[PDB]
Design a binder for this molecule. Structure first.
Ligand SMILES: CCCCCCCCCCCCCCCCCC(=O)OC[C@H](COP(=O)([O-])OCC(O)COP(=O)([O-])OC[C@@H](COC(=O)CCCCCCCCCCCCCCCCC)OC(=O)CCCCCCCCCCCCCCCCC)OC(=O)CCCCCCCCCCCCCCCCC
Ligand SMILES: CCCCCCCCCCCCCCCCCC(=O)OC[C@H](COP(=O)([O-])OCC(O)COP(=O)([O-])OC[C@@H](COC(=O)CCCCCCCCCCCCCCCCC)OC(=O)CCCCCCCCCCCCCCCCC)OC(=O)CCCCCCCCCCCCCCCCC
Ligand SMILES: CCCCCCCCCCCCCCCCC[C@@H](O)O[C@H](CO[C@H](O)CCCCCCCCCCCCCCC)COP(=O)(O)OCC[N+](C)(C)C
Ligand SMILES: CCCCCCCCCCCCCCCCC[C@@H](O)O[C@H](CO[C@H](O)CCCCCCCCCCCCCCC)COP(=O)(O)OCC[N+](C)(C)C
Ligand SMILES: CCCCCCCCCCCCCCCCC[C@@H](O)O[C@H](CO[C@H](O)CCCCCCCCCCCCCCC)COP(=O)(O)OCC[N+](C)(C)C
Ligand SMILES: CCCCCCCC/C=C\CCCCCCCC(=O)OC[C@H](COP(=O)(O)OCCN)OC(=O)CCCCCCC/C=C\CCCCCCCC
Ligand SMILES: Nc1ncnc2c1ncn2[C@@H]1O[C@H](COP(=O)(O)OP(=O)(O)O)[C@@H](O)[C@H]1O
Ligand SMILES: N[C@@H](Cc1ccc(O)cc1)C(=O)O
Lengths: 320, 98, 347, 49, 44, 122, 458, 55, 104
């Protein structure tokens, strides 16, 4: 049965499934730092579900088949051309930033739904609470306008206030010259054009806004580059945290019921991402919108509801 | 009608006029509502006693009960209003227009 | 709010309305009104925020004043005739006070100001309840005491309600305020025919309730409270906007849609008495409601407004909660005119 | 093909389908029977046959 | 070559708190996207 | 005004008095019943369209239930409506029969004895 | 007459069940078959009407109108499929559905036996027309046009409704046969005057009457081609049909209530003909032409003579065909050059000779060259007006001079002179467009061969 | 002078102007309960004198 | 960006003669185009036009023109034979009409 008021009335309660290891974990860090490996190790050791960082096609992997769609029908933005031409007059930069924030919101909703449904913990790379640093690094470099920042702040204000911040925030600190050396050793021709000022802006945003404001909600575990490979020590540092200061201890059955109703129904999660604020970077004309929607509806498993597409092998349609 | 009936009706009219004309405090208007309830209680009791309507004697008590409910309701709302603004002024209830 | 507590409060609202509808004693009718209001106040405050609190406070003040006037009218009627049964209302001053109290409860002009504010301050579900279920009890009482009504006062209030509903709706970009002004105009239409035929009042109430339920359910399905947010729905689900356009046309009263049936019937009834000027005025005034419905239809269905990029993500997900009665409500809102004679079953 | 369960599977919900079909059939049979008895009672009361 | 459709300038006519703005109501603001006004610092 | 609420002998919430059993029931091929079934079919199609299912083929059991429910309600609705109109006619004829002074049958005049003004068109 | 109504209702699901690339073929074929079936209604009697049932009847006035409606549907389909090629399948089916619903409403309107059923259908025709105009029009003005189309109509028709129900409370019936047989004169009182105005103004605004005509240029210019065809050819004739039906209960009040409308019709006929002489948009010229011809029809209905009624019927049929043909002719050039300015594309006879022949024949029928049925209707109305008053021949005469002028002006501007040098995208005429022009024009001359079929019940 | 100006001016433009002005007059209220509760008092007194005193 | 919105450019119009030199202007699909032409020509000209004109031309005389002419011929013959006037100013017999008693 679908979770709802009826399930809550008889039986189902979230508070009982929490078994001292729920602990939503996020592992933040600068570009090219090894935060993903640390998050994978934390998830493996503690037995929590690992969520890889949400990209342009995160929503594609959770709907239909998990395969990504064409960039025209999903995202409509490019990271590679953001690196190539960050000051392009077609609005690619803020479009990419807004789409990435929406993807992060969807991933956070998925992780919260899983945790509240099963009681198992989750480990995320970045979150909606951390995305803004990139936006700041975009604004200080002149890549986006101030109106874009205002729109981003409005959307974040109406979206991020409805969820619970993570239990423990893990940060990996890597100096900018080391990051440049790692990027050069990587070999991707699009990341070599990242100027050091952009990385320094990301680091400044992190260390001056995110960590100070996150430390008030819960204690923050910072690790340098050398003491992050030893994942067992990080895990046993996590295991001895006194987590009784944030909003998580101030949660009972009814608040959990409201949150669980919110985390499912992804349309209600994404409601305020498409607010009618007409920025040229993200506003799409009627003709292009109609053409792109017609193109999307013609994908092999997208015309009808999931179980009603006989062109991908759905049977017994006329009894469903 | 005797003079007493006219006096009670005048009291009800005065309380209604006091409710309809707000100054600043919501509490004063709630007091005017309570006064209207009291006037109705007195008027109904006098009518029921005059005509010796025995079973109607329980009617005014019922009135009082719902008066209390109405009184409680108002007070509850006032609390919330105060918690929003630090005051109970009706000027602050202007977020919604016609 | 706990779902159990919410169910109990909804049941108490409905029980108060039913007590009003089944009572023979004026005290029990007043008690039904009190219980309905007491249970209705928290339902308006379900999603807590300052706007909801303001709407609840305004609603409480209006309804409490109306109930005080109601009780005073009852007591005056008892004084001049020792009667508790709801009947021909032996006193004219008491009848005037009763009419004013019931009009204030219904939101008829000139006691109309609270309706747009309360509707705008609450959620769409609370607005649905307020504009559909809350009309039943006062209209039932008015139908029961119709023979003693003063036609001048009620006709004046009905004409004022139609005029004010049209003029106020002309100025709105918020969908809830549009619905509230539409409700004011439709209440005016309902009360215009009440002194002549209560069956026509019941028919108009039923058709209005069906159309309003379809409207509110379509607005909940596409999470839009403003014109600009409703102008995006075509790029997510065009079927919803097309059904909305047809429903708006029906609410405008155009033949051969169902919304034409009540006005037609009411006009005919008014010409069975003499009453020629008033129906003509009422129809010419309802043209204003048709105008702003048509403007909404222009914004949402007949033209395509620009959209946003993030809308692409919304393409990948489906509506989770489904309204089981929405299709039947739409069909009853649109294609019911050929079954007009079935109104005989209402009397 | 779907990445998720899609709770409505390839086979339809047999309980719901059976309940719906049974309700429709029962309503049709009830309507036929009621119409037959109504015709009989009208004929008896007015004495046509 | 193609049918006219509303653009941003057309759509901005319906984005205000009211149609037919006047001098008095030109300062009315539209309600917040969610119906939550920012909390005042009415310290007691 | 309420014409029929206080009609003597009326049972409060019956919906179908026993006297109505003396009227011929509507035929099962009544065009009004066919239109009610059409309304049910339209409701089923709209249900399919809103749920993003193939409109004509998605649920045949659901569409069948829609049509059946609409027809089932329409039959009794038509019965009650016909009963109400029969009651109105019965009361009207009885009242005309019991008040002959208010309904006189005056003498008939032929058109050869009635003087009608002629208005030429020119 | 369900043998015509049911096949259109069957056109509906046939369109919605058709294969994506066969909608036009199926719709056109079955529309033509329905027109062929409706051709049998022309067998009329000399004494009474064909009373099919309690609900529908056919007269010698409504049968040619029904034939015109059923014949216009396939022409509209042929004219629409060019500019709707880029449209999606569902929206094309919705457009065809709008056209079919309009035909059904018109067919039921022209044959309803009761006046309230007639009113309901005659208002129901509003919705598909408004949807077509505001959804498939090309420019931003269409929205305004739609509003002008709607309220102008409703402000006329809402009083009529009241009057109708009032009449049913007085006489007990709105059946047209009962109304005709039990007719009683209207006395001279203020109440009767306002009843007359309520019964007349809706049809007046439908014609439209001069002074109440401002909605028509907007609606007929901003509409797509099929919308303009059905607005000019059939929807304007609703007013004339309704007036000829309703005038049976308005005597002898009409004898003096017609004076303001007669003066408006004659002077405004002169005025709209004059307006046609200085017009930069080719579609607006055709719209104002329609206004002038309808003013003639209004005069004919108002003077209330058998000759005027015959002339009015003939003129309505002839104008429907001619104005629809002219709108299609203008649409061909618009689709070629994407502009409605008349002087933009000139010398088109050099580039498109057969289309120039079609233009010449259409403009010849517009100026009522004898023995076309346009001329027959115009001459009957002029003779009746001369009997009404010998001075009318002045105004009518002036109209006959102006019409031809602007008509030929239009031709001379578009076909003659030298071609515009920079316009190099004028392709040869398609078979579809030539067939459309022929299917417009041949019935006109065929009807000339047998004019008693469009002369009405008188 | 006639078709584009005065015929527009009399019927449709005047109607639009009047309806717009009345809409502005009716809908522009501050949302203060004080003002329209005073309005309620005025309405009650008028309804008690104009309609109720005459029976 | 010095732009206002992201929009597709207005496309050029397609010439049906480019891909189909004999295109009939009905459809871009040549076969569907040809059959649309054929059905329009057959059901518009061959069926409705010519056969409908023939059907209308031979419609039976339900207007009773020939019957009226023959009746008038008989009436004229009889009246001229017996010397009666061809037509009477009264179409109704006065013996079946009762005028008002007094005109003063
Ligand atoms: C009066 C006489 C009788 C008339 C009755 C009244 C009219 C008919 C009944 C009305 C209700 C019936 C249909 C209701 C459900 C339709 C909803 C829908 O979306 O349709 C899509 C659906 C196609 O969807 P699909 O097949 O799944 O794949 C395509 C995708 O879905 C692609 O879908 P998409 O969503 O991606 O496409 C988007 C599209 C989707 O938007 C729509 O499709 C619009 C549909 C709105 C439904 C109507 C509203 C509610 C009804 C009120 C109607 C009022 C009528 C009165 C006049 C006023 C006019 C408003 O939106 C747009 O493109 C925007 C266009 C803007 C134009 C706005 C105009 C809309 C209002 C016009 C309504 C006209 C009446 C209905 C027209 C036909 C509709 C199918 O259409 C159909 O195929 C169903 C219709 C045909 C089934 C019936 C056939 C019966 C069986 C055949 C045999 C016949 C038996 C005869 C017996 C004899 C034995 C031989
Ligand atoms: C009067 C002579 C009678 C002859 C007996 C047989 C006549 C058979 C005609 C059948 C109907 C005509 C078909 C109409 C469509 C036009 C054909 C077309 O598209 O052209 C392709 C075709 C191919 O040639 P092309 O090399 O490709 O060159 C085409 C270029 O675009 C350039 O081509 P274009 O430069 O060669 O011009 C095309 C031509 C075609 O354009 C047209 O104007 C023809 C349409 C007629 C005018 C429509 C408005 C006038 C209203 C009067 C209605 C009369 C109808 C009567 C009943 C008709 C039954 C269907 O226009 C003209 O040549 C000048 C038009 C001026 C006509 C002035 C006469 C006014 C009325 C006089 C008497 C009428 C009543 C007769 C009885 C009176 C009492 C005894 O062109 C031709 O073959 C020449 C057309 C023949 C001219 C006919 C004119 C006289 C007939 C008038 C009515 C017939 C009455 C028959 C009863 C017996 C007497
Ligand atoms: C917009 C379309 C309108 C539809 C409205 C909802 C339709 C579905 C609701 C189904 C109704 C359920 C009722 C059946 C159970 C029996 C109840 C019965 O006992 O009630 C009777 C009452 O019968 C009901 O009134 C009949 C309900 C039927 C309403 C349909 C008429 C709608 C007008 C015509 C439009 C076409 C409708 C098409 C239907 C799909 C008792 O009469 P009474 O207690 O003495 O009346 C009290 C009030 N009085 C005295 C003041 C009059
Ligand atoms: C833009 C185009 C719109 C459409 C045009 C519609 C045309 C409508 C015009 C109405 C035609 C006549 C209406 C009434 C007939 C006579 C009117 C009156 O002027 O005649 C005299 C009336 O006398 C005086 O004039 C009294 C009327 C004066 C008051 C009327 C106001 C007219 C002023 C102009 C206002 C513009 C109206 C149109 C607004 C758009 C006749 O004397 P009398 O025999 O005693 O009256 C006959 C009726 N009786 C027998 C019952 C008594
Ligand atoms: C491209 C080249 C063009 C030029 C070359 C042409 C070659 C020669 C062909 C031209 C022929 C000349 C025409 C001369 C007339 C001869 C035919 C005429 O005599 O027949 C008429 C008959 O004509 C028909 O009656 C008129 C046709 C009917 C028109 C209906 C059109 C079909 C419907 C199409 C859609 C409707 C749209 C309009 C809605 C109103 C006479 O009728 P009537 O005097 O009695 O007959 C008496 C004897 N009867 C009764 C026993 C038969
Ligand atoms: C007593 C009351 C009488 C009621 C009569 C009401 C007539 C019904 C029509 C109502 C028209 C309302 C139009 C209006 O007031 O708004 C002015 C409007 C503002 O445009 P919006 O769309 O609102 O803004 C969008 C951009 N922000 O200005 C316009 O341009 C309006 C354009 C369309 C108007 C069409 C009106 C046509 C009227 C024809 C005659 C009918 C008049 C009815 C009475 C007839 C006399 C008996
Ligand atoms: N919010 C964002 N804005 C712009 N770029 C982002 C954003 N999030 C991630 N990226 C890009 O993703 C790339 C790699 O992501 P990152 O997690 O830092 O490295 P790794 O894959 O080794 O964990 C980088 O080029 C980074 O710029
Ligand atoms: N109303 C006319 C119509 C008619 C005209 C010409 C005819 O030849 C025949 C009939 C009759 O008589």
């Amino acid at each position: 049965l679908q979770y709802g008021p009826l399930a809550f009335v008889l039986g189902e309660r979230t508070t009982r499934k929490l078994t001292e290891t729920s602990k939503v974990i996020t592992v933040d860090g600068n570009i090219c730092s090894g935060k993903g490996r640390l998050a994978r190790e934390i998830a493996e050791k503690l037995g929590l579900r690992h969520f890889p960082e949400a990209g342009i096609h995160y929503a594609d992997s959770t709907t239909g088949d998990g395969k990504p769609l064409d960039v025209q029908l999903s995202g409509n933005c490019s990271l590679e051309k953001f690196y190539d031409d960050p000051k392009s007059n077609d609005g690619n930069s803020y479009r990419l930033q807004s789409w990435l924030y929406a993807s992060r919101l969807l991933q956070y909703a998925d992780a919260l739904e899983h945790l509240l449904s099963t009681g198992q913990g989750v480990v995320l790379e970045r979150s909606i609470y951390s995305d803004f640093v990139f936006l700041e690094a975009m604004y200080r470099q002149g890549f986006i306008r101030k109106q874009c920042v205002e729109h981003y702040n409005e959307v974040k204000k109406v979206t991020a206030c409805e969820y619970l911040p993570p239990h423990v925030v893990v940060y990996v600190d890597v100096p900018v010259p080391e990051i440049q050396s790692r990027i050069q050793k990587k070999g991707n021709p699009h990341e070599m054009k990242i100027t050091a000022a952009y990385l320094q802006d990301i680091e400044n945003a992190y260390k001056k806004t995110f960590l100070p404001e996150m430390s008030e909600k819960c204690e923050v575990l910072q690790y340098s580059a050398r003491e992050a490979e030893d994942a067992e020590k990080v895990v046993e540092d996590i295991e001895y945290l006194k987590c009784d200061k944030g909003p998580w201890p101030d949660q009972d059955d009814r608040t959990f019921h409201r949150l669980r109703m919110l985390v499912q129904n992804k349309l209600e999660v994404l409601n305020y991402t498409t607010i009618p604020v007409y920025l040229p970077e993200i506003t799409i004309g009627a003709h292009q919108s109609d053409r792109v929607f017609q193109k999307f509806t013609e994908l092999p498993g997208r015309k009808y509801s999931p179980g009603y597409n006989e062109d991908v092998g759905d049977k017994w349609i006329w009894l469903k | 009608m005797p003079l007493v009936y006219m006096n009670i009706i005048m009291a009800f009219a005065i309380a209604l006029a006091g409710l309809l004309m707000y100054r600043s405090h919501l509490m004063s208007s709630l007091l005017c509502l309570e006064g209207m309830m009291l006037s109705l209680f007195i008027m109904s009791t006098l009518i029921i006693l005059n005509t010796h309507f025995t079973l109607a004697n329980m009617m005014p008590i019922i009135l009082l009960v719902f008066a209390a409910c109405e009184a409680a309701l108002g007070l509850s709302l006032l609390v919330m209003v105060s918690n929003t603004y630090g005051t109970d002024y009706v000027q602050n209830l202007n977020l919604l227009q016609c | 709010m706990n779902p159990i507590i919410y169910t109990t409060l909804i049941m108490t609202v409905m029980s108060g309305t039913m007590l009003v509808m089944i009572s023979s004693h004026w005290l029990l009718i007043w008690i039904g009104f009190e219980m309905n209001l007491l249970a209705m106040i928290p339902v308006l405050m379900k999603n807590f925020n300052p706007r909801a609190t303001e709407a609840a406070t305004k609603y409480f003040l209006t309804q409490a004043t109306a109930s005080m006037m109601l009780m005073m009218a009852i007591i005056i009627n008892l004084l001049y005739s020792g009667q508790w049964t709801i009947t021909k209302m032996f006193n004219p001053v008491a009848m005037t006070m009763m009419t004013m109290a019931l009009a204030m409860k219904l939101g008829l002009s000139p006691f109309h100001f609270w309706v747009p504010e309360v509707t705008q301050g609450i959620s769409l579900q609370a607005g649905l309840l307020l504009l559909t279920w809350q009309k039943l009890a006062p209209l039932s009482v008015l139908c029961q005491i119709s023979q003693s009504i003063n036609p001048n006062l009620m006709l004046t209030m009905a004409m004022l309600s139609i005029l004010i509903g049209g003029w106020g709706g002309l100025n709105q970009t918020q969908l809830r305020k549009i619905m509230a002004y539409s409700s004011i105009a439709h209440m005016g239409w309902m009360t215009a025919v009440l002194p002549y035929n209560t069956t026509m009042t019941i028919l108009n109430l039923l058709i209005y309730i069906t159309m309003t339920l379809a409207m509110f359910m379509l607005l909940i399905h596409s999470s839009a409270t403003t014109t600009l947010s409703l102008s995006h729905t075509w790029n997510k689900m065009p079927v919803i906007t097309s059904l909305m356009m047809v429903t708006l046309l029906s609410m405008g009263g155009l033949p051969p849609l169902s919304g034409f049936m009540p006005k037609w019937m009411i006009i005919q009834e008014m010409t069975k008495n003499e009453s020629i000027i008033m129906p003509t005025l009422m129809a010419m005034t309802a043209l204003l409601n048709l105008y702003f419905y048509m403007r909404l239809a222009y914004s949402s269905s007949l033209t395509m407004f620009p959209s946003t990029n993030n809308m692409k993500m919304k393409w990948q997900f489906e509506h989770t909660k489904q309204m089981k009665l929405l299709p039947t409500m739409i069909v009853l809102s649109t294609l019911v005119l050929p079954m007009t004679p079935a109104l005989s079953s209402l009397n | 093909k779907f990445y998720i369960r899609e709770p409505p599977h390839g086979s339809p919900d047999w309980l719901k389908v059976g309940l719906t079909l049974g309700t429709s059939v029962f309503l049709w049979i009830y309507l036929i029977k009621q119409h037959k008895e109504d015709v009989l009672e009208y004929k008896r009361r007015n004495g046509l046959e | 070559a193609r049918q006219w459709q509303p653009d941003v300038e057309w759509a901005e006519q319906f984005g205000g708190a009211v149609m037919y703005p006047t001098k008095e109501t030109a300062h009315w603001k539209p309600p917040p996207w969610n119906d939550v006004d920012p909390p005042k610092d009415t310290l007691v | 005004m309420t014409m029929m609420s206080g009609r003597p002998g009326r049972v409060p919430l019956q919906f179908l008095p026993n006297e109505a059993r003396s009227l011929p029931p509507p035929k099962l091929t009544d065009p009004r019943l066919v239109y009610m079934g059409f309304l049910g079919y339209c409701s089923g199609l709209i249900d399919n369209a809103i749920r993003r299912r193939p409109v004509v083929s998605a649920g045949l059991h659901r569409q069948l239930l829609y049509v059946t429910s609409f027809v089932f309600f329409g039959y009794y609705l038509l019965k009650r409506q016909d009963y109400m109109y029969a009651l109105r006619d019965h009361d009207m004829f009885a009242y005309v029969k019991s008040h002959p002074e208010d309904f006189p049958e005056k003498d008939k005049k032929t058109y050869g004895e009635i003087l009608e003004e002629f208005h030429p068109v020119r | 007459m369900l043998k015509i109504i049911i096949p259109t209702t069957m056109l509906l699901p046939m369109t919605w069940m058709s294969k994506h690339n066969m909608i036009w073929i199926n719709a056109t074929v079955h529309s033509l078959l329905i027109s062929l079936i409706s051709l049998s209604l022309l067998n009329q009697l000399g004494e009474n009407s064909l009373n099919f049932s309690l609900t529908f009847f056919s007269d010698s006035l409504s049968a040619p109108l029904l034939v015109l409606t059923t014949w216009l549907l396939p022409l509209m389909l042929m004219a629409s499929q060019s500019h709707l090629s880029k449209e999606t399948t569902t929206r094309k089916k919705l457009y065809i559905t709008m056209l079919i619903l309009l035909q059904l409403f018109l067919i039921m309107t022209f044959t309803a036996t009761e006046l309230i059923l007639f009113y309901i259908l005659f208002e129901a025709t509003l919705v598909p027309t408004l949807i077509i105009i505001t959804r498939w029009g090309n420019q931003t003005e269409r929205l305004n046009a739609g509003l002008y189309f709607l309220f102008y109509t409703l402000a006329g028709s809402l009083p009529l409704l009241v009057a109708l129900v009032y009449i049913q409370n007085t006489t007990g019936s709105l059946n047209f046969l009962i109304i005709h047989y039990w007719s009683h004169p209207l006395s001279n009182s203020w109440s009767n005057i306002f009843m007359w105005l309520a019964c007349i103004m809706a049809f007046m605004v439908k014609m439209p009457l001069y002074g109440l005509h401002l909605w028509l240029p907007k609606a007929h210019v901003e509409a797509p081609i099929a919308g303009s065809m059905v607005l000019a050819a059939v929807l304007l004739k609703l007013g004339g049909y309704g007036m000829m039906r309703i005038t049976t209960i308005l005597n002898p009040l009409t004898n003096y209530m017609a004076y303001p409308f007669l003066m408006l019709s004659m002077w405004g006929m002169i005025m709209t003909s004059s307006i046609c002489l200085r017009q930069t948009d080719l579609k607006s010229l055709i719209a104002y032409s329609s206004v002038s011809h309808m003013a003639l029809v209004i005069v004919a209905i108002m003077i209330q003579t058998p000759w005027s009624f015959m002339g009015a019927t003939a003129l309505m049929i002839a104008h429907g065909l001619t104005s629809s043909m002219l709108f299609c002719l203008a649409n061909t050039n618009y689709e070629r050059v994407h502009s409605r300015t008349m002087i933009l594309a000139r010398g088109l006879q050099t580039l498109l000779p057969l289309m120039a022949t079609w233009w010449l024949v259409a403009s010849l029928t517009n100026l009522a060259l004898p023995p076309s049925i346009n001329l027959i209707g115009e001459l009957f109305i002029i003779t009746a007006s001369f009997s009404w008053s010998n001075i009318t021949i002045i105004l009518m005469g002036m109209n006959m001079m102006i019409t031809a002028l602007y008509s030929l002006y239009m031709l001379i501007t578009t076909q003659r002179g030298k071609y515009t040098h920079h316009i190099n995208n004028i392709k040869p005429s398609f078979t579809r467009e030539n067939a459309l022009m022929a299917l417009h024009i041949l019935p006109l001359l065929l009807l000339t061969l047998n004019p008693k079929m469009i002369l009405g019940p008188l | 002078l006639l078709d584009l100006i005065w015929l527009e001016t009399i019927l449709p433009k005047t109607t639009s102007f009047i309806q717009m002005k009345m809409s502005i007059m009716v809908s522009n209220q501050k949302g203060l309960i004080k003002l329209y509760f005073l309005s309620f008092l005025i309405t009650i007194m008028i309804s008690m004198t104009l309609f109720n005193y005459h029976e | 960006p010095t732009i206002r919105l992201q929009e597709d450019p207005d496309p050029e119009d397609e010439n049906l003669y480019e891909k189909n030199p004999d295109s009939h202007g009905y459809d871009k699909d040549p076969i569907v185009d040809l059959w649309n032409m054929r059905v329009v020509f057959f059901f518009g000209f061959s069926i409705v036009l010519v056969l409908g004109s023939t059907f209308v031309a031979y419609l039976p005389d339900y207007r009773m023109q020939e019957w009226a002419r023959r009746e008038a011929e008989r009436l004229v013959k009889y009246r001229e034979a017996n010397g009666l006037p061809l037509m009477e100013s009264n179409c109704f017999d006065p013996n079946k009409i009762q005028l008002p008693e007094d005109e003063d």
